[PDB]
Amino acid sequence: VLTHWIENNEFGEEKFLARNCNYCDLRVTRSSFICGNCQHVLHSSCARIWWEIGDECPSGCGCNCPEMFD
Amino acid sequence: GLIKKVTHWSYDNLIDYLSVNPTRDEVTHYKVDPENESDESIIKLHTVKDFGSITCLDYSESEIGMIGVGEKNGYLRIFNISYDIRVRAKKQRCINSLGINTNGLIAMGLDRNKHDSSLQIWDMNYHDDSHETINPMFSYCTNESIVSLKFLNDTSVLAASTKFLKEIDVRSPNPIYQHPTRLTYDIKLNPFNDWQFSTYGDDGTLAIWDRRKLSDASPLLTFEKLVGSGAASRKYMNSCFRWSCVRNNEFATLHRGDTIKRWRLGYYCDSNIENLFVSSVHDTNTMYDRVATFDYIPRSNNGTSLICMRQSGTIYRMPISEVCSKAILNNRNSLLLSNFENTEIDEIRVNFWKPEKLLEKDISVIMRTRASLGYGLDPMNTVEMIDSSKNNAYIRNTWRWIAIAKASVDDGTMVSGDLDLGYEGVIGIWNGILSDKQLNKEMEKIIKLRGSPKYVQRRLCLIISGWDLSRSDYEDKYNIIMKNGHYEKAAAWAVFFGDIPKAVEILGSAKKERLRLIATAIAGYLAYKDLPGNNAWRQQCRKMSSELDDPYLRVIFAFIADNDWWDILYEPAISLRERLGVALRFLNDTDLTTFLDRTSSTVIENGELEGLILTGITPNGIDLLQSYVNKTSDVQSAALISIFGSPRYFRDQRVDEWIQTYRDMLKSWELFSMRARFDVLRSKLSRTKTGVLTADIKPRQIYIQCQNCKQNINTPKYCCPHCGSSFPRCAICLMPLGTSKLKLNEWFSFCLSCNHGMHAGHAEEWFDRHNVCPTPGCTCQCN
Amino acid sequence: MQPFDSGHDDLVHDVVYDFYGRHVATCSSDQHIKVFKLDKDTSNWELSDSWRAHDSSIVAIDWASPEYGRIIASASYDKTVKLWEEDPDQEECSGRRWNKLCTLNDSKGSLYSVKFAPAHLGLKLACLGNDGILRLYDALEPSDLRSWTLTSEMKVLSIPPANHLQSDFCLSWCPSRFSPEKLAVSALEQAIIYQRGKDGKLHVAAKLPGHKSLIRSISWAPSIGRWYQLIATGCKDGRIRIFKITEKLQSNLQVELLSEHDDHNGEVWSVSWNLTGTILSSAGDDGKVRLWKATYSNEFKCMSVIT
Ligand SMILES: [Zn+2]
Ligand SMILES: [Zn+2]
Ligand SMILES: [Zn+2]
Ligand SMILES: [Zn+2]
Ligand SMILES: [Zn+2]
Ligand SMILES: [Zn+2]
Ligand SMILES: [Zn+2]
């Protein structure tokens, strides 16, 4: 099993922000977390912090990631 | 004058100085304590009151106290201050320079003689004590006039003349180089970089020379008319230039006897020779005018004081102020201060005014404290938070109205039908503005969900403002306010509704004697309305309403004294929701229209947050919030209010700017939890009546493959649903991936470097005591 | 006013904060950069790395936005721009914590000011020196932050300054996410606002008037949604000039001076804004630091003064 980034033709800020965490807004390169309903990354510490005080995706796309990452 | 700082002479921390008065008739030895700035530190030890027309002066670093003094007549008196021998040349003429080496070699310059050498150097220990003339070991510069010289090393000596520069070594009669120039006076060497020296000029053209550029042409730096002129006219020059002895590439020039400029230099290497250039000039004004010569004083911690000799010969001490060089401001309202002198950095923390008090009263730290407390998320929580902390009440009132309108929208009220009517304004409902009969009938339907032709619009306005409430619940609200303790507010509401005997009953059941006296005064009204004016009682009530401090008691006295509402509708220190309530209850159509127009036109230009009750979350509401932002620099409330209606109803760039600014501020405060809550709240409030999400979301980023059929393993089991391959297991418990509040034992943590997955709890437990990936054949510190 | 020693052996030229407000970076003329971290427990600033950076005196440094990582753009007097990225798998206070990324050897003169662009422009860089040429450097490829391209090259001076006369340069970008690209360029005795056009090339949009002497520092107030922008300038005269700009070359912009304050009676070396554009802090030749806040009106009035 290997992870593959979604390839999109971007030019500015969003090319850098496509591969960034959605809670701390930093680059993700190690120890990630990937949801399946919405394809948004998170850090390990960011997820273990956010899901204690969270119910939805931190990017606000309307996906209940605790029940829909499968 | 001539001030020369002498080193290697004091065992203690004091620094010794030698001075020559501007009359060139006296030599004084000084000791200056640098740690004390006062003039008592300048101590005068010994004075030698002889000679006459001194032209040069030097000192011996190796042997303590030995000081050579030149003369214009031609005698070089070499003696001690801390014996006394006098020498002269073989042919006596005017001495223009001097130089004492480290081992004991003493040089001399003379004027132009057609039959004698100018540069004559000898030794202290190899001269006869019974002969006045010198015995020069080496003689140079025939038919030349030496103007300045300085010893570079134990052998070589640098010299200068009226048309040439000379660097002559004692081990070879041929000079090293001869550069033609007009700038030869007062050769001074840099105490850090020995390859750079600066000479004066006849017209005052200082030039920082390089030995290597002439050794191999051009000067390294030049300054047209920098120092005072008169080099070739007066042999008694003024030392108005000093190389610094505290830091490199710095020097001081004294201009017009009053100002001192600390020139600083910049250097680069064209790749050993550093092509210098001037970066910054720091000016300092002397304490007293008419200063001829000066010198540095090295202080501790890179400090600098200046010792200066005036034209009268009086010597004082002047310090250099610690000028702040950079004043940047943090996001946490903190001030950083760097100095132009030393390296320590000053910090002002948030923890005329005081700086700490100003930085704690600033709206940046106000917004930071509110965002840490949880401002703007749930409006009832905002109102409770404001009520549980102290000066700000109109924010509490507009958040209370926002809570009322949000409860109305969430309860299904005023969202049904073909007209959305979400967070609309009182001004918008009253103005109206595709069929008039259709909008009237849907307003009637809205009334049916829960005297004047515009009775339906008045009822919608009272529903919006949260005032359509029964009399039993009015009495319950009276009891609630009485239990809270705001008897003035309860009596104000009773006067607003018109039950004056009930107001007297409410105020009479109070523990305050002032409230009881006000209750009696209001009780003097029931049998007193059917009367004309000016009967003393209305006069006293008017004076009270003018002089009293509480605005509720002010408007109570005003209405009870005069039964008119134009003295109540325009009081600025009462709630605009209450003013709208009494205006909708009592005033006529034309009077209500005039009041609404005046109040809306006032609040839109003035930026009052309580004009949102009148104007709603509309483009006019965004204009009101824009004026509030321009007035207060509060983007937090503007964002947290404009998120309720903007992506749902009207696209405008000002709301986007406020949202982006507040999110960047939350990132700068490291409030990631609050930023995520703000984002999910925007996504909750961005849903329309249908349910379509209208807010712009980040695009999808990554998906998981399985390397056999090269497809996604989960559709937007413990096997791939396409090729049937086995998912990798957690390295701790050997349990495979499963596809088809979040616990820490459900989701894998797929590192994107080594592509090795563990469960969340297993990975946290394994990386809590290790820093290596658990799968064999990998080297990746995931966590 | 508790001080901490930076540990530099010579004059500290420029100090800046990061985005989070817990890191500072100090460049100096001892050809060093030291980055300090704000301790959470002891609340006392302590060193993180102390590495020699350039071959001459470093005069201007600037942090990048944290979404692009930890990148420090150091400009010095040796005609170079050096970019430094933090590698976390290295011990603190070593000298190899901040690995070098690139040298921009496209400068023919000693630099004075370097400033990173706002985040919505990407990873853009601005470099100005005594060459009189402004060169914009872009990090186009996010896969490798070691290739930087030179795109915009606008000349701000007719001739370079003399070897002996002093000159000072300061840059300040435009932190407005819903306005076109703007840049403030203080070259000697010229304050120039450079705006991006429809063709993608910068042009002279407007010039801030006044400025009878040499300009020492320029600063752009953070746009927090107001309809007018603010630029603060400190001259070699004692004038803290706050310029008001209204914008409506797709968009034209007009420059109106809001204030001209002479409470320093010297040379205003550094003038800088706050996070929200409310507090203006200025340092002058009188040894005093003056804080400035707007009144009930829009005119600025002096507040508590730190000496
Ligand atoms: Zn993260
Ligand atoms: Zn999502
Ligand atoms: Zn999801
Ligand atoms: Zn498969
Ligand atoms: Zn497991
Ligand atoms: Zn691995
Ligand atoms: Zn890994």
UniProtKB/Swiss-Prot annotation, chain A:
Transmembrane segments: none
Subcellular localization: Vacuole membrane
Note: Present with 556 molecules/cell in log phase SD medium.
Function: Component of the SEA complex which coats the vacuolar membrane and is involved in intracellular trafficking, autophagy, response to nitrogen starvation, and amino acid biogenesis. May be involved in telomere capping.
Record family assignment: Belongs to the WD repeat WDR59 family.
Quaternary structure and partners: Component of the SEA complex composed of at least IML1/SEA1, RTC1/SEA2, MTC5/SEA3, NPR2, NPR3, SEA4, SEC13 and SEH1.
Protein name according to UniProt: Maintenance of telomere capping protein 5
Organism: Saccharomyces cerevisiae (strain ATCC 204508 / S288c) (Baker's yeast)
UniProtKB/Swiss-Prot annotation, chain B:
CDD domains named among the record's database cross-references: mRING-H2-C3H3C2_Mio
Keyword Lyase: no
Origin organism lineage: Eukaryota, Fungi, Dikarya, Ascomycota, Saccharomycotina
GO BP annotations listed: positive regulation of TORC1 signaling; protein transport; regulation of TORC1 signaling
Its membrane topology: Peripheral membrane protein
Other noteworthy facts: Present with 184 molecules/cell in log phase SD medium.
Role played: Component of the SEA complex which coats the vacuolar membrane and is involved in intracellular trafficking, autophagy, response to nitrogen starvation, and amino acid biogenesis.
GO CC annotation terms, alphabetical: cytoplasm; Seh1-associated complex; vacuolar membrane
Protein's gene: SEA4
Pfam entry (one): MIOS_a-sol
Keywords, ordered alphabetically: Cytoplasm, Membrane, Phosphoprotein, Protein transport, Repeat, Transport, Vacuole, WD repeat
Subunit details: Component of the SEA complex composed of at least IML1/SEA1, RTC1/SEA2, MTC5/SEA3, NPR2, NPR3, SEA4, SEC13 and SEH1.
Name of the protein in question: SEH-associated protein 4
Species assigned in the record: Saccharomyces cerevisiae (strain ATCC 204508 / S288c) (Baker's yeast)
Cellular compartment(s): Cytoplasm; Vacuole membrane
WD repeats: 49-82, 90-132, 178-216, 397-433
Family: Belongs to the WD repeat mio family.
From Swiss-Prot, chain C:
Topology with respect to the bilayer: Peripheral membrane protein
WD repeat coordinates: 7-46, 53-94, 106-147, 153-192, 210-248, 263-302
An example Gene Ontology CC term for this record: Seh1-associated complex
Listed SMART domains: WD40
InterPro entries per UniProt: Sec13/Seh1_fam, WD40/YVTN_repeat-like_dom_sf, WD40_repeat_dom_sf, WD40_rpt
GO biological-process terms attached to the record: cellular response to amino acid starvation; mRNA transport; nucleocytoplasmic transport; positive regulation of TORC1 signaling; protein transport; regulation of TORC1 signaling
TM ranges: none
Subunit composition and interactions: Component of the nuclear pore complex (NPC). NPC constitutes the exclusive means of nucleocytoplasmic transport. NPCs allow the passive diffusion of ions and small molecules and the active, nuclear transport receptor-mediated bidirectional transport of macromolecules such as proteins, RNAs, ribonucleoparticles (RNPs), and ribosomal subunits across the nuclear envelope. Due to its 8-fold rotational symmetry, all subunits are present with 8 copies or multiples thereof.
Functional description taken from the UniProt entry: Functions as a component of the nuclear pore complex (NPC). NPC components, collectively referred to as nucleoporins (NUPs), can play the role of both NPC structural components and of docking or interaction partners for transiently associated nuclear transport factors. Involved in nuclear poly(A)+ RNA export and NPC biogenesis. It is also required for normal nuclear morphology. Component of the SEA complex which coats the vacuolar membrane and is involved in intracellular trafficking, autophagy, response to nitrogen starvation, and amino acid biogenesis.
Protein name: Nucleoporin SEH1
Organism: Saccharomyces cerevisiae (strain ATCC 204508 / S288c)
